[PDB]
Amino acid sequence: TGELKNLNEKYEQLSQYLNQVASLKQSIQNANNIELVNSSLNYLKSFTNNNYNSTTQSPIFNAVQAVITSVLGFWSLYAGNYLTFFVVNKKPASVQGNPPFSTIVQNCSGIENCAMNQTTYDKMKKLAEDLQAAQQNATTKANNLCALSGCAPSSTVSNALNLAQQLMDLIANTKTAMMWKNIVIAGVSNVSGAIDSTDYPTQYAVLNNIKAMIPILQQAVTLSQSNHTLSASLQAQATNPKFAKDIYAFAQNQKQVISYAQDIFNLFSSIPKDQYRYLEKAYLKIPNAEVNLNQEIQTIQNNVSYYGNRVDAALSVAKDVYNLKSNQTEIVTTYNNAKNLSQEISKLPYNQVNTKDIITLPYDQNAPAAGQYNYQINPEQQSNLSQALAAMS
Numbered sequence: 284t285g286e287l288k289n290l291n292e293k294y295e296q297l298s299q300y301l302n303q304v305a306s307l308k309q310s311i312q313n314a315n316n317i318e319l320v321n322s323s324l325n326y327l328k329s330f331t332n333n334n335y336n337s338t339t340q341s342p343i344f345n346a347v348q349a350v351i352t353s354v355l356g357f358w359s360l361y362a363g364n365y366l367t368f369f370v371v372n373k374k375p376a377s378v379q380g381n382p383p384f385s386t387i388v389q390n391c392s393g394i395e396n397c398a399m400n401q402t403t404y405d406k407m408k409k410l411a412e413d414l415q416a417a418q419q420n421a422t423t424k425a426n427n428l429c430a431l432s433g434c435a436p437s438s439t440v441s442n443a444l445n446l447a448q449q450l451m452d453l454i455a456n457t458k459t460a461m462m463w464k465n466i467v468i469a470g471v472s473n474v475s476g477a478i479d480s481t482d483y484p485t486q487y488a489v490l491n492n493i494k495a496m497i498p499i500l501q502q503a504v505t506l507s508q509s510n511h512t513l514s515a516s517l518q519a520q521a522t523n524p525k526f527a528k529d530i531y532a533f534a535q536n537q538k539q540v541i542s543y544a545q546d547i548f549n550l551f552s553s554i555p556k557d558q559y560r561y562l563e564k565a566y567l568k569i570p571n572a573e574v575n576l577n578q579e580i581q582t583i584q585n586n587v588s589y590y591g592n593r594v595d596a597a598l599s600v601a602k603d604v605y606n607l608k609s610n611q612t613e614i615v616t617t618y619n620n621a622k623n624l625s626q627e628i629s630k631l632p633y634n635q636v637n638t639k640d641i642i643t644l645p646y647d648q649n650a651p652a653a654g655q656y657n658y659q660i661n662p663e664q665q666s667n668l669s670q671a672l673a674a675m676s
Contacts, residue, residue, distance in 0.1 A: 291675045297624050297625060307610055307617065311611065313603040314610070317520060317522070320520065326594070335431050347428065349576065350493070350496045353496075354493055364380050364570035366465070367382075368397050390481055440504060447497050451497065460484075462481045463479055466478075466561065467569045468567050471561060476557045489555070489558040489559070489561075492553065510537065513532070530604055531605035534602075537594045538595065541594055548583050563577060611656060642659070
């Protein structure tokens with residue numbers, strides 16, 4: 284029964300053409316569904332505007348907040364109000380927070396160097412002070428980062444990100460190790476899972492991950508800006524190959540903005556738990572004598588699903604619009620293939636299933652009855668065909 288095998292794969296192929304046609308109809312309908320298309324577009328524009336102009340409701344703004352917070356947090360751990368290294372005037376420097384030299388004896392035994400030039404430290408400190416000011420007005424305690432649209436709050440986010448970039452490169456490049464034992468945080472540095480090691484900052488994942496966040500957000504900030512321009516050349520249709528291309532590009536771009544936010548969330552999520560406990564309470568570091576990173580991360584996660592699931596939906600409609608012309612060609616080819624294949628099947632004496640006119644294009648005297656592409660698949664005959672495929676198992 285070379286008979287049966289031939290039939291079984293012809294059957295499986297017709298069945299596939301029919302599934303294809305059904306799926307193409309839906310795509311074609313969506314693209315011609317003006318209200319759905321406008322809606323998807325308006326969603327994306329809306330999302331672009333919020334992302335670009337808001338300081339509460341922008342996913343990229345909120346991702347920046349969290350990253351800056353986390354940069355200042357690491358700074359506070361590393362240096363802050365009680366240095367985890369020893370600074371020296373090229374002996375011991377007059378700067379605030381410098382620990383006693385016994386620190387070095389006790390915690391920096393072995394081959395690694397825990398000293399730093401005052402030169403190098405003062406630049407670090409300067410950058411950190413700037414980035415602090417850029418995040419917040421010291422007396423008002425109110426936000427000082429501007430919406431991504433600019434400062435029409437006195438700091439651009441690009442500025443803050445550039446500060447952060449400089450500060451972390453400097454920390455990573457400087458061959459001074461940090462003594463984690465110098466960090467004192469009640470309920471953290473004195474319990475199981477406290478961290479008391481001494482190594483270069485680049486050996487701690489928390490540093491590397493925070494560092495990797497910055498270039499990501501710099502890309503996201505640029506992408507976010509150009510999207511606001513693209514958004515101006517697209518309006519809701521009352522009814523263009525130019526539109527089809529643009530909306531699809533526009534939609535993908537919105538997806539990438541969201542994806543960048545998710546990339547940040549992922550870099551927070553993979554910080555080792557023990558290190559994250561210090562970071563999240565860096566503001567409680569005690570010196571030799573309110574920050575809420577968790578809420579800011581939560582806000583990123585929520586933004587990603589809240590906005591991002593909608594941008595996926597719109598993207599999927601924009602894809603249907605982009606593929607309209609091509610989907611029209613493909614549905615026609617596929618119908619014709621299905622029609623010819625059903626005829627070849629009909630002419631087989633051993634053929635058991637009735638397939639005549641299994642797919643058709645309804646017509647009313649001088650025109651298609653309900654659209655050029657609205658093929659009707661007979662459901663009895665399709666059911667039959669499927670049942671025969673399943674029997675052939």
